[model samples]
Target chain A: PGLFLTLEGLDGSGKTTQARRLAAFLEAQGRPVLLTREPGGGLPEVRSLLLTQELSPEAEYLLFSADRAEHVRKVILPGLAAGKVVISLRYLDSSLAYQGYGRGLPLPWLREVAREATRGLKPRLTFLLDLPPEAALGLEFFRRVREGYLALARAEPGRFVVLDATLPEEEIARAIQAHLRPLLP
Target chain B: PGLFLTLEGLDGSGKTTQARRLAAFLEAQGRPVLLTREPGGGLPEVRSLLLTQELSPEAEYLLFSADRAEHVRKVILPGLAAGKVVISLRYLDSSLAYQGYGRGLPLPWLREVAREATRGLKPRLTFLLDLPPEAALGLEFFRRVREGYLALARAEPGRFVVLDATLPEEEIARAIQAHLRPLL
Candidate 1:
């Protein structure tokens, strides 16, 4: 069976560059790769859920959970069932980051509700591009986004591989490759 | 546990009057009673869900489900857990009527989501007040409402207790009393 990988990090954290590099490298290795993001992953239900900024947190959470249920039914499950590698550019971790930690949703409720939302789909190998607080401000719209991602990273370090974003491009790429190479074979 | 009964029916089927009478009957028996309706039963979230109408059928189903989930959490579950005889004027069954049959949502999907919403909380006793289309049109603001409820009752006859609104008020009350007395 193929694997499911996810690239998670703050906005302007070279997410696009890293995701593209990894996808290209995997394609070179003859692995079928799919790349997507959250709040706008081409699912109408998920899109609708994210569009509601005025919804109460619980209401928002249920909608998000419902969207994931529908999305898994429509896309993720089918892709995995077909033996294709699925790479989500952003996923549940974003919610954990932005809503749970950044906005400080109750820890237990966030976990319980998010678990209900995703229906127990966790990433196989997560590539988190960690950067210093200083590096975050250097990029466009990075300061706020970094606070969100790192807040979540601090909350749950077990699921993340914290690679220094201050490292040179090749080093960061190497770090990602080193963590994922074993899973590749 | 006293009893958690719901009075459901089309608009002109005398559900409001019947609910009032039922509450009075319970009071006569010295049993504490509460009567309330959907989206208006002191649930803020459910009320908001009812107010949001700009949605597709699927969104409508999900919103109603979300409302029901919150309703149970904030209202019904707490009341039932307290061992109170809560009389919800409308319940999950109403969704089957309003959204399922009236709006033509897929029954299986409606049942599936509604089951999730209510967490499988079925009422202990239900009184589905049935009426005919012509009888409902006798009053204004009831034509559409009656159509909606009647379609649902027709689709799921087993869940309903068909009432003849053409009969005398005392006769209808007797029928309702017959169904509800045992539970009381």
Candidate 2:
């Protein structure tokens, strides 16, 4: 099995750029790489509903879980099984940070649904691109979510690498690649 | 809240016919009735994937859960709040039997996912049209699912009404009506 690496951050946090940058380096090294993202899959209708419709946190989480379920089976797991490095932009942590901490849904309920969604696939390393809160819809909620991401990092020091989102792209990429040198198997 | 009544059984078992007949009778009585089916509601895309695609039980169950979550919010819960009888063709027990029992997905996982999907909305009455297995894919698998259904009924005697599917449509309707009168 290849390394399962994930990137975590707010929407449009420039985190995706860092993820792809890392993926490019790995790709150039002649390693098979499958770069993907959460709510990421063949289900376009599913993503449409998530973006356009006003749904309760419960409804939202289930659709994301549903999408995550497909993403894991069809994309992530298969890629890893085929000896390819799987780089996902987000994973179960987004559900924990957004739905659980930000939207005020119960964390246990979130994790319960995630159990089947992710099939217990933990990324070998989760790069948390941490950021400051500045949303108009209660900075307090975004603040809570940011803290939530940090707490998740602290809870799994071995699995997560916290980095500053505002840092230069080149710098963040270097840090990520540096972490990978020891982790490469 | 209104009465939540559901019908459960194999596909094309004349069960839908009976559900419609009951809905018609209730509709004639000036009582509002919302006759619906599971995998029901506005999302045709969800249903299409279910019918056309070959999906693992986990993927299948979660899509069903996503649709059910929407169904509960937009359809069932609203019908109950407006004091209308909500008649669904199938409910969570279908998943319990088809996916959990038939496909061998863990029942606890199915139920746990269902917990968020149904949001604790239990049907007041469930009419199960019981049948014998006849599929070449494995009558034994169908047999297990049938037994799974019956075990569910026995586990909740007060909620389930197990009727023989082989009976005439009229006879089954009459039996269902007779059961409802004493309680309704």
Candidate 3:
């Protein structure tokens, strides 16, 4: 019911910095903001297992979705229900891009599982920190992941704002502020 | 491609005892057997977290399914591929009974997620140690779980062999052995 914001990009695509900037900007303006990340915050063991184990693609995605399920129920929904601005560094879109597009899982299945995991919770605004694969990780697979984010943004034009992640931190923060202007109460 | 066998029932329904007896019987007959259980045999921390946390039904199921995903990939499939008789104390049906039927989540969703978790690996033979709700634990919710197992067995008659768990442990072992004779 409240503002649900998410950031998507490659690992080094400035998502963390922008998330902080956005949270700070919203907080400075006196808006209640709960900033979190995916596969995060709760269940430290699940996170540890995810990183330490060499899991299959299916196993890996299921673990992420499981953690997302917990995150959405435990963290995100609570923040939204309290009418706080909930900003997550990465959410379902990261799975669709990394596990779906980059790793070659069927997108339809990922979406179907994600619906159940997040209980159909979607972000009101999603910021795609568009970064060239070379600038971010220099991996060819990350290039496909970037395109995956673009494709997702293209599919949901009203919900996404694509920005050049290579831009200076303040510039990206300004762009985010421009988008948040009318949405803020 | 080898045999994948699973046992299902309530807590005191003798699934563990029967599973062990069955494995011993097969091993005595010169068959390879890899016996294991759910939320078990790997990732002790996941099991610990599951026991400690007060998880939502969905979160509970997801954690179980996540552990199962790892189990199936790491343990079950490998044993089966090497042509061993993989016997698990519990499998997806436990989730269907406990989470879906007992807890009231949609069965379709559980099955869908399970399909992904196990990579669509269905057991060749599933032994349901049928127990009356009163006889086993006397909990009304468990009655629904018993019915859930029955419904699952009914849906796939060929794949399941339901034996009264109240019977003597050896007697249930004999019943299971009878069913395994033709397959062997």
Candidate 4:
């Protein structure tokens, strides 16, 4: 069996940095790890569309879900099936935080559509790099998104490791490694 | 309120020919008619993606829904709000017929996603151009798709006008105009 891990947080919350570090740490231990990002896993056209347009909330979420569907089909599931540790920078939780909490879409409907899009796939471990809104984007939406992540973590505490992103990089990396140590086969 | 009309059928079922004919007939009668298609409406990028690449069924439907969302916002709703006769070549029923019925996706899930994508918008009048599988593509899939349209028509008989697609072009156009005469 393979492990599916994901990093979640607002932009600039150190998810990218920590995800890279975690993947490297796993690889150093001779574990098969596949590192990837969402909204663009061999689908460059979808990424360009997301960057270039201002779509309605419904349209935007649908496009993102479409990308996720393709990404899951083309990249994520295959990696897991091949018995590799799939570490993604973002996953379904990002949509819940950004679209549902930030943009005010109904969470129930988002979850319902996401079920079809991802086929009910979820990360085994989600490293939520928790940060205060002012420290990150300094925007009002970031506040709501932060709450959304916390709410999600609270809903499923077994899957999430809520780390204080304000801590030093080395400290966060060490904490992540400590939590991940017991999960290795 | 503006009259919203849509044409549904397999490809080459005279939808394109009859849609243009009906639009011209209405315009000639001093009606403001907006004729359009989906998967592309000021969103050329989405259309190019659909054409250039193979997408999963969910992705394909979502892309179409995205295109429809923009089309509804930019074209359909505006034309309707301005009281113009909006005649679209295809609409939500196309997805139901093609994706749900032909592709075998769950119809209820398709409807759920479509509801959000279209914001629950539906056509006032839908023209179901009935064509046999041999008449259209001679494929088994087209046969299933035809049944899908029939099922939808049965579900909403008051909204759909089932027409024999094998009829003469002029005759089909004349019948479409006759239906419009009352709405106008």
Candidate 5:
């Protein structure tokens, strides 16, 4: 009945704006869109994860893992069971970036934590908003907002969909839509 | 067979000194003594845990838990099963102090981790050297030596022998002897 699509990127990289545009586009095309963010889906027990700053580097990794576990149990599985395409705004990949790359925590250990968190569920496809770090940093307010996001994208490259952040908003949106067209009904 | 008697305390609070004296005193009384420490007993896996820093609190906790599991699986259970009164310099009590009290981690959670580490083995007895944090900090060179030991004793009181650490060395030794008198 619907697909869960999540958009993730550094602040001012337009992840939020793109998520909204994509949701509208999908809904208009008669596909149900569940637009959500990481540590979202309103899971109760994992609410402690929202205080992301309180955790130590390793704790941050584990907490996110736990959060994702709860998310899969509470949100994604139910949607997938209903034959819907489940998408999340951000997921375990960010932890690989933040904990493995940015925090420089042990890669093997972080990978183990990742395995435990998602139970090996990865998005069928991910839209990584591409942005040059310096150019993306140009918007001071947006820069501050996505400081955590940028740190992660800067740390891991293979996960990124890399959009030219400097492109006109409409054009960038078009590129994302074109990528999703085949996946959508 | 000499009973396994261990003295646990803050760093510089004299566990080695006391253990040495106990060994000598017991030897004089014609009782054989064996004093040991975990993470050493010559097992490769246990030795490996000693090398990892595990800087993060959660990682630190998990590593110690894994370390203990290895320790129990490889060292402690076998030593005790061989009909030896194996005196461990430190035990699961150390984790309760370091992670539970010193770090202020939740007690129930700390206990859960400790259980996983030791696989549910309980200590026969534990002597917790109760030193005022002030007295512990006052020792010049040995001040920070056993943060791990202090963390356990200060946090979990019921598992300890609870002697005043500020007392004279001989007095502390006397108290230990009294605690072990029954097992002896």
Candidate 6:
């Protein structure tokens, strides 16, 4: 089976760049690589709603859960099953932080929705780009969400690598590749 | 609080026509009316996905659940709270029958999803239109789904009225009104 990895961070915190670098580095090792993202996996419609609509927290979570259901079934699981390094830009924890912690929707309920969405498929490693991830959802919201992300990292130390997102771009890429190298087959 | 009524059945089963007639009739009786439908309640995106794409049963149901969540929170709950007659073309049982019985997803899981999507909001009444409902998804599938709907009606006697959808549209509407009048 292939390794399932995810990147976690704020919007501008360099998750996408690191994902690309990681995918490139892994592909150079002759391993099959799949790079994908959440609010994604061919779910542009749900992504549009998330961006454009002012949805209730519960509705937002449900839509995300729906997207995850399709993503996992259609995107992530297949990549992992076929022996490819599957890298998702964001995954379940984003919802845990943004919707549950930031928006004050209950974390447990969000987890329940995810259980069916993901079928308990957790990442072998998760890259957490530590930064004040934002709203001005503002300052206080940023603190709450950042804390939520850190708390998740703390609770799952084995699965997470907390990175300083403020580092220079190539430097961040090098650090991500370093963490990913040991896990690659 | 107002009545939350739902119509269920095959696509051609006159559920829509009957719903309109029922709403118009109820309005003349001095009740405010709000008519809505499933794959609906301002969820054109999800409906398009359901129609235009070939989705897994689980994804399909989840999308429907998402639509229902928005519908219930934004549509059904508000209408009923305002004392209006809230008539929906389809509701949870459609999921139960089509997804659960027809497509073979587990009923328990479907119900659990609904529990959240609807926040445990069951309709005051559901009118099941008895007719062969299509692309041959056909014959044996129709039986299984029809059985699923009928079993639901039987189990929830107080909340469901199984109607013969083959009857003339107006006559079916009249029968529906008659059944509904006693409850009103």
Top candidate, metric DockQ: 4
2 or 6, greater by TM-score? 6
lDDT of 2 by residue, A112-166 (tens): 8888778888999999998887721478888888889998899899999999888
The DockQ-derived docking category for candidate 6 is medium
Between prediction 5 and prediction 6, the one with superior DockQ is: 6
lDDT (tens digit, per residue) of candidate 5 on A160-185: 45576668879988988887777754
Off by over 4 Å in 4: A134-138
- Superposed model 2: Cα runs more than 4 Å off: A42-45, A135-141, B133-141
Model 1 lDDT tens row, B120-182:
777766676666556651343344445666665576655556677767777877887787676
lDDT of 3 by residue, A1-185 (tens): 68999999988889999999999898898998999997674444567877745666676677688788888988989999999999998999999998888877888888888887898999989999999987772387888888999999999999999999889989998999999899976
* lDDT of prediction 6: 0.84
All candidates: TM-score: 0.54, 0.92, 0.93, 0.94, 0.46, 0.93
DockQ of each: 0.11, 0.55, 0.60, 0.77, 0.04, 0.50
Model 6 clashing-pair count: 1
Model 4: C-alpha RMSD to truth? 2.1
Winner by TM-score between candidate 5 and candidate 4: 4
Question: How displaced is residue A120 in candidate 4, in Å?
Answer: 0.7
Per-model C-alpha lDDT, please?
0.64, 0.83, 0.85, 0.86, 0.58, 0.84
| lDDT tens per residue, model 4, B69-160 | 77887788889999998888989998899878887878888888877777777888899999897786238778889999999999998899
Better of 2 and 6 by DockQ: 2
Q: Write candidate 6's Cα lDDT for B95-133 as tens digits.
A: 899888989988877876677678888888899989765
Candidates in descending DockQ order: 4, 3, 2, 6, 1, 5
B69-100 in candidate 5: lDDT tens per residue? 55565666776666555667666656555555
Task: Identify the CAPRI category of the predicted complex in candidate 3.
Answer: medium
List native contact recovery per candidate, as a fraction of 1.
Answer: 0.09, 0.45, 0.42, 0.74, 0.00, 0.28
Candidate closer to the true structure by lDDT (higher is better), 3 or 5: 3
Q: Each candidate's interface RMSD, rounded to one decimal? A: 6.0, 1.6, 1.4, 1.0, 10.9, 1.5
